[PDB]
Amino acid sequence: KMIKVKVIGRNIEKEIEWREGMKVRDILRAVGFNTESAIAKVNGKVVLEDDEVKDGDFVEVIPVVSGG
């Protein structure tokens, strides 16, 4: 299983395989960041740190906040 990490609006594309049993959180905690500085979201959809991930979700880590 592989994951791609990118910063909010950083432009980091990296196809990723997959395994079975993992979960968005795990993948996130795999980068020393369980999605604390940003709202983890995949396929344009948002999820929680415990929201399992699939389709090879990426890894967002960094102040993804914004006030519009």
Curated annotation (Swiss-Prot):
Pfam family, one: ThiS
Record key words, sorted: Isopeptide bond, Nucleotide-binding, Phosphoprotein, Ubl conjugation, Ubl conjugation pathway
GO molecular function: nucleotide binding
Record has Nucleotide-binding as a keyword: yes
Position of the Glycyl lysine isopeptide (Gly-Lys) (interchain with K-? in acceptor proteins) cross-link: G68
Residues modified to Glycyl adenylate: G68
Cross-link Glycyl lysine isopeptide (Lys-Gly) (interchain with G-Cter in SAMP2) per UniProt, renumbered positions: K54
Top-rank lineage group of the source organism: Archaea
Post-translational modification: The C-terminal glycine is likely acyl-adenylated (-COAMP) by UbaA, and also probably thiocarboxylated (-COSH) to function in sulfur transfer.
Database matches in InterPro entries: Beta-grasp_dom_sf, Mopterin_synth/thiamin_S_b, ThiS/MoaD-like
Positions where 1-thioglycine occurs in the chain: G68
CDD domains (UniProt xref): Ubl_SAMP2_like
Transmembrane annotation, as ranges: none
Family matches, as NCBIfam families: PRK08364.1
Functional description taken from the UniProt entry: Functions as a protein modifier covalently attached to lysine residues of substrate proteins, as well as a sulfur carrier in tRNA thiolation. The protein modification process is termed sampylation and involves the formation of an isopeptide bond between the SAMP2 C-terminal glycine carboxylate and the epsilon-amino group of lysine residues on target proteins. Is able to form polymeric chains with itself likely at Lys-54, similar to ubiquitin and other ubiquitin-like proteins. May serve as a proteolytic signal in the cell to target proteins for degradation by proteasomes.
Official protein name in the record: Small archaeal modifier protein 2
Source organism phylogeny: Archaea, Methanobacteriati, Methanobacteriota, Thermococci, Thermococcales
